[PDB]
Amino acid sequence: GKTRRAEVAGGGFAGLTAAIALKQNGWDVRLHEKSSELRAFGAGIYLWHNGLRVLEGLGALDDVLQGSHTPPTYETWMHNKSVSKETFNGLPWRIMTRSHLHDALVNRARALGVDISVNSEAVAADPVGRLTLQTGEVLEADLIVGADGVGSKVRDSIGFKQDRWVSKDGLIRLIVPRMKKELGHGEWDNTIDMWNFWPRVQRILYSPCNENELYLGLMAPAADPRGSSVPIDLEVWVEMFPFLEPCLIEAAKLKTARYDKYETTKLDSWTRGKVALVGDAAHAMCPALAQGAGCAMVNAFSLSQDLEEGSSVEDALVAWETRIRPITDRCQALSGDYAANRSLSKGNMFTPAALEAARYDPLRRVYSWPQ
Amino acid sequence: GKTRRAEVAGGGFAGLTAAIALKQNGWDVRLHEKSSELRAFGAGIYLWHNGLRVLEGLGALDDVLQGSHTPPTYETWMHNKSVSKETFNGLPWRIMTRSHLHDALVNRARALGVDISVNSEAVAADPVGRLTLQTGEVLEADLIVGADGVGSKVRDSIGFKQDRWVSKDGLIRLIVPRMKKELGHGEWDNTIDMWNFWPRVQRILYSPCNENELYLGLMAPAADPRGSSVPIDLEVWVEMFPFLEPCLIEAAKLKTARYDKYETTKLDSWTRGKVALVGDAAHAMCPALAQGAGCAMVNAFSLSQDLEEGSSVEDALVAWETRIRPITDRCQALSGDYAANRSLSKGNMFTPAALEAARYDPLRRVYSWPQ
Amino acid sequence: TRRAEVAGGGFAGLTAAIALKQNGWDVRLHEKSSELRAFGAGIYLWHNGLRVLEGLGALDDVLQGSHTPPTYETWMHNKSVSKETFNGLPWRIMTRSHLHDALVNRARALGVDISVNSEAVAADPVGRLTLQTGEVLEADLIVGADGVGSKVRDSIGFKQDRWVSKDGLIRLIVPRMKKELGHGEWDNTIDMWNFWPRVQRILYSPCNENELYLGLMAPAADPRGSSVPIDLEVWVEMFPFLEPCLIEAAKLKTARYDKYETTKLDSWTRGKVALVGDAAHAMCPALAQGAGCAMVNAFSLSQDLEEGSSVEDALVAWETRIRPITDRCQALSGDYAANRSLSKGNMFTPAALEAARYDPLRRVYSWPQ
Amino acid sequence: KTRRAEVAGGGFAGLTAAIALKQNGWDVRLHEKSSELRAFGAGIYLWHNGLRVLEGLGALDDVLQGSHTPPTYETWMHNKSVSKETFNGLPWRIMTRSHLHDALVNRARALGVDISVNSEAVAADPVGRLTLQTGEVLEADLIVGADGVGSKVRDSIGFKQDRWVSKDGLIRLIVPRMKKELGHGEWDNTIDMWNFWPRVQRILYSPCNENELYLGLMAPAADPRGSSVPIDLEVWVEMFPFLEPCLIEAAKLKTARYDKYETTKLDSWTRGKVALVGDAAHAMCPALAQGAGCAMVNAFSLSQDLEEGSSVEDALVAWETRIRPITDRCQALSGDYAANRSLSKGNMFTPAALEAARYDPLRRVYSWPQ
Ligand SMILES: Cc1cc2nc3c(=O)[nH]c(=O)nc-3n(C[C@H](O)[C@H](O)[C@H](O)COP(=O)(O)OP(=O)(O)OC[C@H]3O[C@@H](n4cnc5c(N)ncnc54)[C@H](O)[C@@H]3O)c2cc1C
Ligand SMILES: Cc1cc2nc3c(=O)[nH]c(=O)nc-3n(C[C@H](O)[C@H](O)[C@H](O)COP(=O)(O)OP(=O)(O)OC[C@H]3O[C@@H](n4cnc5c(N)ncnc54)[C@H](O)[C@@H]3O)c2cc1C
Ligand SMILES: Cc1cc2nc3c(=O)[nH]c(=O)nc-3n(C[C@H](O)[C@H](O)[C@H](O)COP(=O)(O)OP(=O)(O)OC[C@H]3O[C@@H](n4cnc5c(N)ncnc54)[C@H](O)[C@@H]3O)c2cc1C
Ligand SMILES: Cc1cc2nc3c(=O)[nH]c(=O)nc-3n(C[C@H](O)[C@H](O)[C@H](O)COP(=O)(O)OP(=O)(O)OC[C@H]3O[C@@H](n4cnc5c(N)ncnc54)[C@H](O)[C@@H]3O)c2cc1C
To answer: Is CATH 3.40.50.11540 correct for B41-97+168-262?
Structure first.
């Protein structure tokens, strides 16, 4: 009395974004992270205008921009031949390690006074406003946020209709030193998406995060016993990416690299009663448009906006989904099409349609940076 | 009544910005333009993050972004050799025709209900809150804004201490078709600053505004009777910029081109009683950093911010100048140094110091996009 | 006066006829087809072949109207993987008819007797050549220069290892369309390799300001790539930067898909019979030395016949002196073909260039690598 | 009946004449004024014409081994590449001068040419007499004045000439390639690097082989820094920073010289039994890189005309008539290029510029058409 209370399950980008945005609006917010430490996995990440605008709204933009990188261009190669160079007509974008982004959100959530619990796993949620932890402890609140990832127990304990999919193939994602000097002549501040189908299917997404750190995604079929191996098989990667040898040598030193498969989900509904699902829990998607976390953050931020309208929580949640979900649905669908067709291999695929989610400004609720 | 009243002298970028920002804050605003038509001269213009943020604050950003251009890179040439390519670490920037920008500000000021008078010339202002027109008509107001350009009569009728300066050399600025196809192979969406000292001092700043329009600045010494001639001496320009021949041919058709010299002013004070000087009236500068209008817009917008603090107008004006002027002073000084030393000819000159003004966010009052 | 009968009016036969005639031989040459003509569109010659032409007095007629690219470039999947200029070693590209005309005109100026529609059907080491008219000709020397299907060779019975590939290529002369090709380095040789999305290759070879020589290589089991007249779409699809030239190529109704063919013989001579060119040593074309070696060998035969020996002895000395250069070139070129080595670029090594470096006039290797 | 020739001068022209004469059964003695056989000027370009002479001298393969043909002849103006030329296959070659000189000396020695160092011709007589600085008077059927632009064979006789020296010059050096240190680029190319701004400074960059680089540093004599020897490292690195590793080695060369350009044109190349060849007769501006080329073609051609059964006197007249217009035209065009700085524009090796290079002295025809 009379403070609205929110329990947030999940300490990833969506959960942290929701917790900050609610807390800024005067909610009493508690956040539960299942693992032993607040931490992001996946090495590196791209954000665009939409996600950057969310960060502005969270008061964490400038902490993220300091120590992250915008390449001079987004370049695509096919068999070492440059097939496209894209700068998106000025649309802002940024590459950073996941921990850089995650640290900035943690720092902000903590500074705002978000109640943070780790080793705290949500195992059940009730639409009347109850969150049950693995300890058996039952929490009552006016709002429950399921931001607990693609394997969401908040979602599955309630039983939402879904269409869930797991990929055949996967990739290895790593942070290594830039080795820029050792790379010699070239445009080594660029994003370079290096595709190959001959002599083998192997791809590297080359992604500078700053002056010190390079984010690499190494993509090879699961049925390729060498290309999919971790720690990496140096020989098969150097063979097809010899110009990256200095960085690949450093990558081969990382004993805890993982080969991860892609996973998606689409839900009929994102809400039930006082429970809202946000992020991968609601809309895990293919990463072709690099909008999974971007949409997760736009959605979590937009949830806080609809909760300011004076409505009941239940009504605000229905209004939220109705307003914001089509942007995500369209983005998820197009990114799935790109993934299935290997569209990015052709270059020049960041079309106006592809950049729709990136152009969205969640703060002013309009589309900006026209294409 | 209790409705604060502002009289704004000058219908340029500074005047229009001040009128919009004040009107949005509930001022009763009247704007006076000396000439017979609201219109901008000078062909094309660059804005950066700081000015784009002002546009966001004026509710005119997206009208400007639609139909303007961000080059993939800002390139510098010396004797046809590329000596630098700069993308400013993601810092937003934009090139556009002056009429594109000016139309967007006029549409917005008009839409908001600003009282617009043309053929209305301010010839005297009084710090107690009086503006006199050339008609002899005397207007009383709570705030007087001198946005009447480098030859400000609002300023000179009051007698501000100044250090005024006029260049010996100048340039011809024009809008022509892109002729992109005709330019053949190259990077013709780039900004390209093409310097030459041999065989003659001639420079062209090549600045695409959109798919249809190209902004060209043709710089030659005033003592050069061919290079400084208007309409342009096609031969002496084609001779040193042969790759631009299709565009230069179009430029030669422009009968109303002008050769304009540069002009600067620096004032000990920007305010006196209820009178505030904004834009070129207060701080006309060398255009090396392309920040003259950017600073003018930031200062005009920031004026409206300080007027929301519940102070007397007089105190608010003093607080405004104290808060905002050092950014402009430093920018003016550095741009003057660059101009005197021809620093831009070396390339790579958009350093962190050069970009200080561009990095400023007038909305949040912090510096963004670190360099 | 010594008499020679030469079977075959290709590069090897014409070279032999001219070289012998210059040395005072009385020479008649027999061409099986009804007109003197060279097939195969375009051809590369190197230092060795150019030196032969100098020795034949036909160099300048060949250099006028032929082309040396600024560089020999190799692409893999449109990526430039090498540019080679061979440390100044001279080389030249030309239409086959240009080279063939220069040789025919020289032979005619010298008084070589040429009979078209005259086929050698049998030969005898004692010095007899039988024509398809049944006429038996007697001579001090018989030159079997009658190509890979040599009847001079097969009527005598030379032990050989003869081979034909299942795959082949289409060779055409088209206009340069240089302006329509827009920006690039369109005076270069460009060997444009691809294995993905399909196995298709174009050897791009400018012959002069007007004529471009193209070799379009696709497997026989590819019904589109191997089709004649060309399936325009499948070629434009993988070589879109060549569309103006391919459009012209598509108009060529008489285009052929020719298979590769090689032979290696234990012996090149039998009594007064000498086999030269494809009759003796047809090879894979990777090193572009088939005619080069043929011409060096035919020219060298005339040299050994000036030593005062019996023809029989001179022929043995000729083979002993000159064949290892050809054997090594043939073996390396076959290795390159089998391993698709040219696809890697930078493959014109000192070893690859051995034949090209040979100067048949001074009998030394020049242009070191 | 053994014909006898005395050749004054042991540079490219003298050695070429001596070899060619000797090959044709002349008894040949050659006199070199300096105390040792040696070529100065660091490096040198030869073209088809000069390479053909070497073939005719039986010295081609010794020259080709250890010399270099660039992939392309490139020109820069203010660091911008303005042309790349390969001359439609026309053979050319860059080498150190000592490499060329050594091949010629070794060949003359193998043929039995009698060479006297520290032997200066101080006077000549058209009747066939050569006077040495020992006062010895030599008699011969042919006297070859191959004694350079300051020819005493020429001046003792008195040939009408127009001789000229420039105020400006250049520094020519051989340095290591430092190819790895040069990093990314096309460092096997010839690169003629022109600048007029901020200062008039030019470097002709000329690789001779895997180990040696030939540099020509051209600055006006009135520039006390650019014309300084040993080189003012700073002013060269300033305008050619991409060549710093090579220039650092260049700065170590204490015996560097600033040499001035010299030309001469004579109304006549012959007098009685005396023939003037090379710089003695036709020193020219170096734009077309044909000074030694022409000298060698002319020296080789002289031996050809002496094989016709004429008197030496008649053969010399026929020689000059046959061969001089190629040299006259080359010299005139080269001087025009030098005066107009034409090479700075690129693409200047036109058919006309390449006329001398295209000439084949062995078959007496023009080859490699342009
Ligand atoms: C290969 C790949 C590349 C990608 N690249 C990009 C990109 O460049 N840009 C971009 O925007 N997106 C990208 N994405 C997508 C992005 O990773 C996801 O959309 C994003 O991380 C989703 O965040 P989230 O907070 O919803 O889920 P998660 O990041 O999975 O976080 C949920 C948090 O859930 C905690 N948790 C789980 N279960 C419980 C529980 N029961 N109780 C309490 N806590 C729990 C998890 O441990 C964790 O701390 C990429 C994805 C993949 C697979
Ligand atoms: C060559 C050059 C290039 C430049 N490029 C850029 C650039 O790329 N980016 C950038 O941000 N800046 C640039 N600038 C600077 C920019 O042009 C100015 O700073 C800007 O236009 C100043 O706007 P203002 O409204 O203060 O003045 P002005 O634009 O001069 O406008 C004042 C308005 O004053 C009206 N007026 C005048 N007198 C009276 C009066 N007595 N009563 C009523 N109205 C009056 C004038 O007619 C006009 O309508 C450049 C300047 C130059 C010279
Ligand atoms: C695809 C391909 C590309 C090649 N590219 C090059 C290249 O770039 N450079 C190069 O040097 N080589 C190249 N070659 C090889 C070159 O084509 C041959 O080595 C050369 O043509 C052999 O010439 P020849 O005179 O021995 O035989 P052929 O050219 O076959 O000529 C023999 C002549 O034989 C006449 N004839 C045949 N039978 C009789 C008979 N019974 N009686 C009388 N006359 C007869 C034939 O009709 C014809 O006129 C290439 C070969 C191929 C297949
Ligand atoms: C800067 C520059 C660059 C050049 N680059 C090229 C180039 O790239 N390619 C090219 O072909 N040419 C080039 N040349 C021109 C070339 O150097 C000359 O044309 C060539 O060296 C002339 O040779 P020569 O034998 O006539 O004279 P020299 O080389 O001058 O030789 C005469 C020889 O004369 C000996 N001697 C002198 N006086 C007497 C005497 N009285 N008695 C006996 N011996 C005497 C001299 O000491 C010496 O040993 C260049 C010239 C210059 C200036």
So the answer is: no
